[PDB]
Amino acid sequence: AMSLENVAFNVVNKGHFDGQQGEVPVSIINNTVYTKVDGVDVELFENKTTLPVNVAFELWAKRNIKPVPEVKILNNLGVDIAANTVIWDYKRDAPAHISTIGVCSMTDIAKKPTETICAPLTVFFDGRVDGQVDLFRNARNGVLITEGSVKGLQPSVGPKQASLNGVTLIGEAVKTQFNYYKKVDGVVQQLPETYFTQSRNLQEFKPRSQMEIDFLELAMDEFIERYKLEGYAFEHIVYGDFSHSQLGGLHLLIGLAKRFKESPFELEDFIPMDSTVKNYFITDAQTGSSKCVCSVIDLLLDDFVEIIKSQDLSVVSKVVKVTIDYTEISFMLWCKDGHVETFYPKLQ
Amino acid sequence: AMSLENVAFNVVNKGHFDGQQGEVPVSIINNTVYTKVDGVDVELFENKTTLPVNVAFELWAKRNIKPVPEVKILNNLGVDIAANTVIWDYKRDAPAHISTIGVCSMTDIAKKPTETICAPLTVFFDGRVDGQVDLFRNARNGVLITEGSVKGLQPSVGPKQASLNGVTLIGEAVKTQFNYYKKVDGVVQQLPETYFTQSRNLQEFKPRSQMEIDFLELAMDEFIERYKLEGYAFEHIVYGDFSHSQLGGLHLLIGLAKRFKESPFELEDFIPMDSTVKNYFITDAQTGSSKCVCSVIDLLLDDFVEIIKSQDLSVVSKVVKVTIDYTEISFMLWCKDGHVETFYPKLQ
Amino acid sequence: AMSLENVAFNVVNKGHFDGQQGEVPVSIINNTVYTKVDGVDVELFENKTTLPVNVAFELWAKRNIKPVPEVKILNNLGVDIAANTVIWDYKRDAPAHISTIGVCSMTDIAKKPTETICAPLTVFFDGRVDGQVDLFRNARNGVLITEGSVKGLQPSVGPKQASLNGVTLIGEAVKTQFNYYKKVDGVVQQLPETYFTQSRNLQEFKPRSQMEIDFLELAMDEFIERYKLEGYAFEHIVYGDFSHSQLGGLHLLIGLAKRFKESPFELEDFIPMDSTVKNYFITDAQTGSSKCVCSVIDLLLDDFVEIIKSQDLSVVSKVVKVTIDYTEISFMLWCKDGHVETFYPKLQ
Amino acid sequence: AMSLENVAFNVVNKGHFDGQQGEVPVSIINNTVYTKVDGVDVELFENKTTLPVNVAFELWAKRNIKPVPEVKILNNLGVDIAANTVIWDYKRDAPAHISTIGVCSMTDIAKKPTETICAPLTVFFDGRVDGQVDLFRNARNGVLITEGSVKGLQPSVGPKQASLNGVTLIGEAVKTQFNYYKKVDGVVQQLPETYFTQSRNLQEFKPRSQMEIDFLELAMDEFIERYKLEGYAFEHIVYGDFSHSQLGGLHLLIGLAKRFKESPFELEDFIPMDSTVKNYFITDAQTGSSKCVCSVIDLLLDDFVEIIKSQDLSVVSKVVKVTIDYTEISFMLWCKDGHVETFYPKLQ
Amino acid sequence: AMSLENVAFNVVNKGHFDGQQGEVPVSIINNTVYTKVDGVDVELFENKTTLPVNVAFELWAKRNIKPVPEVKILNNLGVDIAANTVIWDYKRDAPAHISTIGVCSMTDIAKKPTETICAPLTVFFDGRVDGQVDLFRNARNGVLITEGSVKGLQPSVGPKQASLNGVTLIGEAVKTQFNYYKKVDGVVQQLPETYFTQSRNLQEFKPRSQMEIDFLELAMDEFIERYKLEGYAFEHIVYGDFSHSQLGGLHLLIGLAKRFKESPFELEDFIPMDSTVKNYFITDAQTGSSKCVCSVIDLLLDDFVEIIKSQDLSVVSKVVKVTIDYTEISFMLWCKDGHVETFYPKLQ
């Protein structure tokens, strides 16, 4: 019994779509959904998607309000569609997937993920919903998340953090660390050994290790001494070189966060989307040092130190592949006389 | 149980809103309403109104599909709103009235015309719908149409023609001639004795009298001779003077229709709406004779001859007030030596 | 080397996309594509589709300019996508199919119809293009058109008419009659024995048989006498009953065309798309007789006479399934005392 | 002498509409009003309303720039329209009322509030403008604000705060505390005894009592001890329970402000408008505790303590009505064994 | 004292901008200008231009309503801007020139054509307006039209036809044949000896010579015999070859008009603008013969016969430059054994 007026009633009264009966008067003007509240129009939704305004409104109302995997993880695992839910991409202000299964009549390719149209697609299954672990078992392609153990299936421990209504957090009142399972052409995959990005903000950056606490509190030369990082170019890669017109290094989010406490800078997110590696056009406000494409990754400083210290420093230029968020991230490693010159997530 | 998807289901399956249950998938993109038919979007409605697209769609679906009074009559009678129906203005491609009573939740000022908000508005009542003659009796202001007599109420015989789905016609299978009643401040008002405009097109103009048949067949001089119209300036007023840069006269639709059979002309409808008198920026294609504001009225030629022959031709300039479509239309009558020079529907 | 400026250069210089090199300055304002010609913007395309303006522009430029099957035939045969071409739907002013194969980077689901994503879709193949008969042989699902025989494949002779740039015609300088082939799940399907709709207009209707010439010339009673159609309700079904408020019958396009020569009527195409059976909200201008859903089919009068004369007239109400344009069209046959009362393409 | 170019001249030169003569060149592109300043377009106004761009621009230019009652007060008092001013709703970025009286030709229902169309509407009168106290005296329905005493009328002391150009403040250089008067059908109303919401922000929250200073400085168990609030569920209602997946309580703005100093949270304002009680979809970033509909009221903690301590705690579930901002606010009071379990502003 | 409300008042009351004082309430919604007429919005203008809606509305209201040169002539003469008028392009529904001089504050580059910014632009001057012949004399660049002689200036007799409000006509009540003058870099230029295109429609085509009357009446073979056109390929060039998939010839409008009387065809105007030579994607409905780029010129058949009979037929391929509408139109002349094979307005 789906309608625009019922989706709007649910938004107004329940904060989101909750399957409740009722209708509120709605008006659609351009890309905005309004509702009449005491004779005046109140904005309910501004469409930032490439879908029709009323269709995007319904998918946003029908979004998953439980902690879900971050869109970058789902993309890295090859998820095409979700089973009977909408994973809302809060970085793009749009649905994470083109089509739905049992969600919205306009976007639905099927009502149940058992339909033969879903067989070639990697369907996302949520073990927290009844029957979805069995639906994954029967599906040809899919990704499954669970809070606990699945009989006979070997798990992949995912990241500590998940997205709850666009807030990335490590849950204390809710579980955010999931077990991951993947099936390709009916065969359960052995998910690779992986590092995870920490998904922190520059504004509210918090250290998650004694090494990260020491990076933010110590001076550059004290930290590099304490952690035996001489010859690993942390001055360039992590701290950043602001002495020339082209900003040197600055590829770790912790280094950007440290810089941010002292002086501000403009980070232009020219491709605004969730990804393991982010690219910014950075302009340092203090010096005027800038870089059009400054690739930034948020790895735990210990994990980045482990990666850089596990590389052969005998070649001038070399690609270093690292599994991060289940995807293969290529890095460019540049050395001279057995010491690191630069190390950065490889641009195109 | 009103919804956008239900209004669209009714349009698709019933040709208009018919109160049927069901929903079709709808998408709204800009000012157009689409529906998915076999995987592709099919346009159902293009909003040409100043109302939100979904609101205008519902009012158009909920339009009156019975022969109704032409919008010019309703306007001339001071109608502000209709009771539990939508009079669709096909000349403006929009609802004839801003608000509704018991039609659409967005535009509704009341559910029943008995609500105190309707008391100061001239509500249109349709005696063909049960209980509407009683609602007119209780209404402080209103206009009533009926197919027969209402005990005690003195009728006004309206025009022969009515509008059925945008087609103005004199009904043969349906009744289009109504009795008119009006109330101002609780008091039934006597509607004036009036002429009616014939509501004809220039393209499909058909004569409705032997005088009109003779105007279209006889040459200018033999028609003026046959009907004793010498000294009444029909050469200027009805036939039109195309000899100078400013187009002379041409204020009767029959004269424009006669001209149209010999040579074409541009009629620019700069205020596109239904009205007793229409204004056009006319450009004669043959001669290049033009007039920015050429007021045109479609009176039966006999009725126009009666009006012009009932005037005193002894004054140079005089306003002549004639009741047409229940409204007083001022004409400007210009005479010299007891003969008409010009007679035209008075501008501004 | 695809670009908006190159697609626009091809439109301006070649009349459509022709793979020519070059660029013209383009501006996009709202849903319109303009080009600068001597300092002023000239409109190249108005987007009437639900796709982005630049994407719809490219698909329209890349439209098939050879005589192609009419969209109603393709839909009736279950075509989902075309192989390396765009079938443009001139009734909807939009692409006939959502996605493309090797046409446009934005709409492409594949570059070649051999990609596993195309396997479950009924791909349209054109035997007039090199390698497409082979691609049909390899396709899991598909519809093939050819100008001659394909060794081993049993053909279905299609309609005489095809669509060349939106003009439906029976080709004299070009071939418009194709052989049809269909495959469902790797298996070549036998297309049914079918009648074809004639695809004529009400305005430019031309008779295609001596029976059709006699329907338009002879009066109702002498046509029914000459062709022994007494008791088959042609007075109601084909000629139409305009005596009551609800318009009776009028389900054959030839009957509407005959009526159109005497007096005009409004046909409201509330679902504007190509289909075997069309639904119109009809208002007869002469009488005021109207019908919200008047289903109209354009069959050759001989074919309609054959269908109605091949029915058992001994039951009060019965569904009659007739294959027209490869699809099964249900009719409702109503009889009384061994005579037809009504016969109409069954609604909903 | 009202024009778009004159309204724009006033905005550019006076900061708002000031009745000054002059014109600036204006361009309208979609929902934005621009002005040419030295050959380039400078944005003057982005329309966030459901009114036409030029009409909304004029109403915003003609907004009241004196401290006015907050829109939530006006709505609670039943104000329909303002007399010869525009109360701009800065929460909705739109006019607070549909129509105007003597403001804008497009929205005006009358030029003077003495017109019979205004008689049934509750017109807002400002005693600070000459003759408005007399206009209220003569009006059938209305709300009057004054800075001082009105002869013969008994006042209602309103809130300390008013809105000056969207900034809610307790005036020091201007008077923001008004006397309120209301008339219904010619009869001056006895306005009810009421509490007022404090209209504070979460970001710039400031305590307005020693109890509020102690709530923010003391620990939970110290405050509940000092103010004898044991058994009143302040731990749940005011402090908030973040231990479970559903966020417990958190219905007072002071409690949200206290939480905000320690850790951040997402408050989703799904119905963005001014109201006595606000509803937010809250997600606690630290714990992942969330609630789709968390009703929040900003009462002075002393006023909330007075309300909760004046309730009978002997029933399991009970509705408690409290007059806040002249409106009746229903609360849900849940008790067990003579102690409060929860107390919250009642959702639908 | 220019305003949107005053431009709209002039449109409503005068049919166009007439410098009259007054204002009407206006609303702008998207690309449409509306006015309130008795409580409802009536559309005044739909913007089809790339200028802001209110700016395009003012330029259309301020359009030249006197017979003016056709836009193709102005373009061929290199006109960039008009002096104190707007030449409205009715083929593009937009101003013919980007900027104005003394017309609209938004588009104005100057108030008087004597401003140094106008010196490098070819300004159009109208000798029918006081002081414009003098402004042409002082102009560095310009085109002047006059109804009579200008002392000392050698005239160019222009075409018989001009455009009066979008209607191209040879004036009888107005003068449409002008004297043309041009200045490049202060120097009066001698305009070439030229043919003129006749500016006729396919629908309302009328012959303008005994040769043109004979082309439309006589069969192909007897016209070619009567006018001694054997060996000049009129069968291909003028009559058109519809026997093959590619439509042969058909480059003269009279030939298209003759064809149009027997059977219809689609002419796709892919570059919709006024030009000496027009390009159409033509599809013959009868045969299915088509051509993506069919260049069509409307020359008087006598003028085309004179051009083709004045060519040397001894070379296989040759470019023939003919002056038409003051511009040099290149034709491609193809011969074999002393006879014409084809002659067409040379593409790209």
Side-chain angles (χ1 to χ4, degrees), chain B residues 113-115 118-119 123 125 131-142 144 153 183 185-188:
Chain B
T114 50
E115 283 167 64
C118 308
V123 187
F125 300 96
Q132 301 242 311
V133 163
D134 286 317
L135 290 171
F136 170 77
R137 289 195 182 272
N138 292 112
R140 178 170 180 85
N141 301 277
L144 172 66
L153 300 195
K183 273 178 73 165
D185 308 331
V187 181
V188 173

mmCIF file of all heavy atoms in Angstrom, chain B residues 113-115 118-119 123 125 131-142 144 153 183 185-188:
data_model
loop_
_atom_site.group_PDB
_atom_site.id
_atom_site.type_symbol
_atom_site.label_atom_id
_atom_site.label_comp_id
_atom_site.label_asym_id
_atom_site.label_seq_id
_atom_site.Cartn_x
_atom_site.Cartn_y
_atom_site.Cartn_z
ATOM 1 N N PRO B 113 -18.884 22.616 1.527
ATOM 2 C CA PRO B 113 -19.104 24.056 1.307
ATOM 3 C C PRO B 113 -19.889 24.782 2.412
ATOM 4 O O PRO B 113 -20.101 25.992 2.339
ATOM 5 C CB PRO B 113 -19.806 24.117 -0.050
ATOM 6 C CG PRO B 113 -20.365 22.786 -0.275
ATOM 7 C CD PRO B 113 -19.602 21.788 0.539
ATOM 8 N N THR B 114 -20.312 24.040 3.443
ATOM 9 C CA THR B 114 -21.019 24.552 4.611
ATOM 10 C C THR B 114 -20.059 25.124 5.661
ATOM 11 O O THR B 114 -20.539 25.720 6.619
ATOM 12 C CB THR B 114 -21.895 23.452 5.233
ATOM 13 O OG1 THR B 114 -21.128 22.260 5.421
ATOM 14 C CG2 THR B 114 -23.106 23.150 4.403
ATOM 15 N N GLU B 115 -18.728 24.914 5.515
ATOM 16 C CA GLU B 115 -17.722 25.424 6.444
ATOM 17 C C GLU B 115 -17.665 26.944 6.383
ATOM 18 O O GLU B 115 -17.850 27.519 5.314
ATOM 19 C CB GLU B 115 -16.373 24.745 6.203
ATOM 20 C CG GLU B 115 -16.387 23.353 6.806
ATOM 21 C CD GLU B 115 -15.264 22.420 6.406
ATOM 22 O OE1 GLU B 115 -14.088 22.717 6.723
ATOM 23 O OE2 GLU B 115 -15.563 21.381 5.772
ATOM 24 N N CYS B 118 -16.100 29.136 3.573
ATOM 25 C CA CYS B 118 -16.733 29.227 2.262
ATOM 26 C C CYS B 118 -17.817 30.275 2.193
ATOM 27 O O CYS B 118 -18.180 30.668 1.089
ATOM 28 C CB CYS B 118 -17.266 27.862 1.830
ATOM 29 S SG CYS B 118 -16.047 26.536 1.913
ATOM 30 N N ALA B 119 -18.380 30.685 3.351
ATOM 31 C CA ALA B 119 -19.446 31.674 3.425
ATOM 32 C C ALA B 119 -19.162 32.955 2.620
ATOM 33 O O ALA B 119 -19.978 33.273 1.768
ATOM 34 C CB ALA B 119 -19.797 31.983 4.873
ATOM 35 N N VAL B 123 -19.372 30.122 -4.155
ATOM 36 C CA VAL B 123 -19.194 28.710 -4.410
ATOM 37 C C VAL B 123 -20.062 28.282 -5.588
ATOM 38 O O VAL B 123 -21.203 28.677 -5.669
ATOM 39 C CB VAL B 123 -19.493 27.865 -3.140
ATOM 40 C CG1 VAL B 123 -19.151 26.396 -3.362
ATOM 41 C CG2 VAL B 123 -18.750 28.402 -1.928
ATOM 42 N N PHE B 125 -22.201 25.517 -7.431
ATOM 43 C CA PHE B 125 -22.976 24.339 -7.120
ATOM 44 C C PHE B 125 -23.568 23.784 -8.406
ATOM 45 O O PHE B 125 -23.987 24.528 -9.297
ATOM 46 C CB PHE B 125 -24.090 24.657 -6.096
ATOM 47 C CG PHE B 125 -23.587 25.191 -4.776
ATOM 48 C CD1 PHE B 125 -23.534 26.556 -4.536
ATOM 49 C CD2 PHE B 125 -23.167 24.331 -3.778
ATOM 50 C CE1 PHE B 125 -23.080 27.049 -3.317
ATOM 51 C CE2 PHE B 125 -22.685 24.828 -2.573
ATOM 52 C CZ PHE B 125 -22.660 26.185 -2.345
ATOM 53 N N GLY B 131 -27.867 16.810 -3.347
ATOM 54 C CA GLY B 131 -27.651 17.718 -2.229
ATOM 55 C C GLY B 131 -27.047 19.072 -2.545
ATOM 56 O O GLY B 131 -26.875 19.856 -1.619
ATOM 57 N N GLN B 132 -26.711 19.381 -3.829
ATOM 58 C CA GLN B 132 -26.073 20.663 -4.157
ATOM 59 C C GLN B 132 -27.048 21.839 -4.289
ATOM 60 O O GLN B 132 -26.677 22.963 -3.952
ATOM 61 C CB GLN B 132 -25.164 20.560 -5.383
ATOM 62 C CG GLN B 132 -24.057 19.544 -5.198
ATOM 63 C CD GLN B 132 -22.698 20.162 -5.250
ATOM 64 O OE1 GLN B 132 -22.356 20.933 -6.161
ATOM 65 N NE2 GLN B 132 -21.881 19.814 -4.279
ATOM 66 N N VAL B 133 -28.303 21.597 -4.694
ATOM 67 C CA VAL B 133 -29.316 22.658 -4.694
ATOM 68 C C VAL B 133 -29.557 23.124 -3.217
ATOM 69 O O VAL B 133 -29.629 24.329 -2.956
ATOM 70 C CB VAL B 133 -30.612 22.236 -5.428
ATOM 71 C CG1 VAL B 133 -31.770 23.154 -5.075
ATOM 72 C CG2 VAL B 133 -30.389 22.219 -6.930
ATOM 73 N N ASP B 134 -29.538 22.180 -2.256
ATOM 74 C CA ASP B 134 -29.678 22.486 -0.827
ATOM 75 C C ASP B 134 -28.486 23.222 -0.282
ATOM 76 O O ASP B 134 -28.640 24.078 0.591
ATOM 77 C CB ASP B 134 -29.866 21.211 -0.014
ATOM 78 C CG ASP B 134 -31.236 20.658 -0.205
ATOM 79 O OD1 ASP B 134 -32.199 21.461 -0.203
ATOM 80 O OD2 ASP B 134 -31.358 19.414 -0.362
ATOM 81 N N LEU B 135 -27.296 22.860 -0.742
ATOM 82 C CA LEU B 135 -26.084 23.538 -0.321
ATOM 83 C C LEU B 135 -26.061 24.974 -0.851
ATOM 84 O O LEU B 135 -25.568 25.847 -0.153
ATOM 85 C CB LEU B 135 -24.830 22.758 -0.721
ATOM 86 C CG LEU B 135 -24.611 21.467 0.035
ATOM 87 C CD1 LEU B 135 -23.504 20.703 -0.572
ATOM 88 C CD2 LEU B 135 -24.315 21.724 1.464
ATOM 89 N N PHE B 136 -26.652 25.229 -2.035
ATOM 90 C CA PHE B 136 -26.761 26.574 -2.582
ATOM 91 C C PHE B 136 -27.728 27.405 -1.717
ATOM 92 O O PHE B 136 -27.451 28.564 -1.410
ATOM 93 C CB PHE B 136 -27.232 26.526 -4.042
ATOM 94 C CG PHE B 136 -27.611 27.868 -4.629
ATOM 95 C CD1 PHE B 136 -26.639 28.766 -5.036
ATOM 96 C CD2 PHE B 136 -28.942 28.240 -4.755
ATOM 97 C CE1 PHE B 136 -26.991 29.992 -5.579
ATOM 98 C CE2 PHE B 136 -29.285 29.472 -5.300
ATOM 99 C CZ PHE B 136 -28.307 30.331 -5.716
ATOM 100 N N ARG B 137 -28.859 26.805 -1.315
ATOM 101 C CA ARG B 137 -29.854 27.442 -0.459
ATOM 102 C C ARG B 137 -29.229 27.847 0.874
ATOM 103 O O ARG B 137 -29.535 28.916 1.382
ATOM 104 C CB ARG B 137 -31.025 26.491 -0.205
ATOM 105 C CG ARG B 137 -31.930 26.243 -1.404
ATOM 106 C CD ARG B 137 -33.219 25.599 -0.928
ATOM 107 N NE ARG B 137 -34.165 25.256 -1.992
ATOM 108 C CZ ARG B 137 -35.085 26.083 -2.480
ATOM 109 N NH1 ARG B 137 -35.169 27.334 -2.037
ATOM 110 N NH2 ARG B 137 -35.940 25.664 -3.406
ATOM 111 N N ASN B 138 -28.324 27.027 1.419
ATOM 112 C CA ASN B 138 -27.682 27.335 2.689
ATOM 113 C C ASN B 138 -26.473 28.259 2.556
ATOM 114 O O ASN B 138 -26.162 28.961 3.519
ATOM 115 C CB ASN B 138 -27.342 26.064 3.456
ATOM 116 C CG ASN B 138 -28.593 25.325 3.937
ATOM 117 O OD1 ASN B 138 -28.906 24.214 3.467
ATOM 118 N ND2 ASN B 138 -29.359 25.933 4.860
ATOM 119 N N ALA B 139 -25.837 28.312 1.364
ATOM 120 C CA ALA B 139 -24.659 29.142 1.070
ATOM 121 C C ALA B 139 -24.917 30.635 1.180
ATOM 122 O O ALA B 139 -25.936 31.108 0.687
ATOM 123 C CB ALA B 139 -24.151 28.840 -0.332
ATOM 124 N N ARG B 140 -23.990 31.389 1.787
ATOM 125 C CA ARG B 140 -24.111 32.845 1.828
ATOM 126 C C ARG B 140 -23.880 33.390 0.406
ATOM 127 O O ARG B 140 -24.628 34.241 -0.051
ATOM 128 C CB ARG B 140 -23.122 33.456 2.829
ATOM 129 C CG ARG B 140 -23.164 34.970 2.877
ATOM 130 C CD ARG B 140 -22.355 35.539 4.032
ATOM 131 N NE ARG B 140 -22.405 37.001 4.047
ATOM 132 C CZ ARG B 140 -23.381 37.718 4.610
ATOM 133 N NH1 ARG B 140 -24.401 37.109 5.211
ATOM 134 N NH2 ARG B 140 -23.345 39.048 4.569
ATOM 135 N N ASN B 141 -22.887 32.864 -0.313
ATOM 136 C CA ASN B 141 -22.629 33.260 -1.696
ATOM 137 C C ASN B 141 -22.504 32.028 -2.570
ATOM 138 O O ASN B 141 -22.004 30.998 -2.118
ATOM 139 C CB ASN B 141 -21.384 34.124 -1.809
ATOM 140 C CG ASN B 141 -21.449 35.380 -1.001
ATOM 141 O OD1 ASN B 141 -22.011 36.388 -1.410
ATOM 142 N ND2 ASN B 141 -20.881 35.357 0.169
ATOM 143 N N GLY B 142 -22.978 32.134 -3.807
ATOM 144 C CA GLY B 142 -22.890 31.017 -4.728
ATOM 145 C C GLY B 142 -23.548 31.192 -6.074
ATOM 146 O O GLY B 142 -24.321 32.110 -6.288
ATOM 147 N N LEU B 144 -25.480 28.584 -8.947
ATOM 148 C CA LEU B 144 -26.038 27.262 -9.099
ATOM 149 C C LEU B 144 -26.423 27.016 -10.540
ATOM 150 O O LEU B 144 -27.016 27.883 -11.176
ATOM 151 C CB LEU B 144 -27.274 27.118 -8.165
ATOM 152 C CG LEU B 144 -28.121 25.865 -8.295
ATOM 153 C CD1 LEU B 144 -27.346 24.623 -7.886
ATOM 154 C CD2 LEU B 144 -29.423 25.989 -7.513
ATOM 155 N N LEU B 153 -37.173 29.332 -6.845
ATOM 156 C CA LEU B 153 -36.037 30.039 -7.446
ATOM 157 C C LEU B 153 -36.277 30.457 -8.890
ATOM 158 O O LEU B 153 -36.456 29.599 -9.748
ATOM 159 C CB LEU B 153 -34.769 29.186 -7.392
ATOM 160 C CG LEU B 153 -34.221 28.736 -6.042
ATOM 161 C CD1 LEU B 153 -32.809 28.251 -6.217
ATOM 162 C CD2 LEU B 153 -34.212 29.865 -5.028
ATOM 163 N N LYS B 183 -26.381 34.021 -5.674
ATOM 164 C CA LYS B 183 -26.675 34.537 -4.348
ATOM 165 C C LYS B 183 -25.524 35.406 -3.908
ATOM 166 O O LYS B 183 -24.377 34.984 -3.997
ATOM 167 C CB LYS B 183 -26.798 33.397 -3.346
ATOM 168 C CG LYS B 183 -28.175 32.820 -3.273
ATOM 169 C CD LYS B 183 -28.239 31.657 -2.296
ATOM 170 C CE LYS B 183 -28.168 32.159 -0.895
ATOM 171 N NZ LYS B 183 -28.581 31.122 0.067
ATOM 172 N N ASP B 185 -24.510 37.575 -0.455
ATOM 173 C CA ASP B 185 -24.822 37.860 0.948
ATOM 174 C C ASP B 185 -26.166 37.304 1.417
ATOM 175 O O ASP B 185 -26.932 37.986 2.090
ATOM 176 C CB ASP B 185 -24.702 39.356 1.253
ATOM 177 C CG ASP B 185 -23.372 39.933 0.823
ATOM 178 O OD1 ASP B 185 -22.368 39.180 0.813
ATOM 179 O OD2 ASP B 185 -23.332 41.130 0.486
ATOM 180 N N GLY B 186 -26.397 36.037 1.095
ATOM 181 C CA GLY B 186 -27.594 35.286 1.446
ATOM 182 C C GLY B 186 -28.796 35.575 0.579
ATOM 183 O O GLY B 186 -29.819 34.899 0.692
ATOM 184 N N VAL B 187 -28.700 36.578 -0.284
ATOM 185 C CA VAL B 187 -29.820 37.020 -1.094
ATOM 186 C C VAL B 187 -29.697 36.559 -2.533
ATOM 187 O O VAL B 187 -28.722 36.877 -3.203
ATOM 188 C CB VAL B 187 -29.955 38.562 -1.018
ATOM 189 C CG1 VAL B 187 -31.138 39.062 -1.831
ATOM 190 C CG2 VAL B 187 -30.018 39.040 0.420
ATOM 191 N N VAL B 188 -30.715 35.844 -3.029
ATOM 192 C CA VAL B 188 -30.772 35.399 -4.416
ATOM 193 C C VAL B 188 -30.866 36.628 -5.294
ATOM 194 O O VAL B 188 -31.682 37.504 -5.048
ATOM 195 C CB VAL B 188 -31.956 34.442 -4.649
ATOM 196 C CG1 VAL B 188 -32.116 34.111 -6.128
ATOM 197 C CG2 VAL B 188 -31.814 33.175 -3.806
#
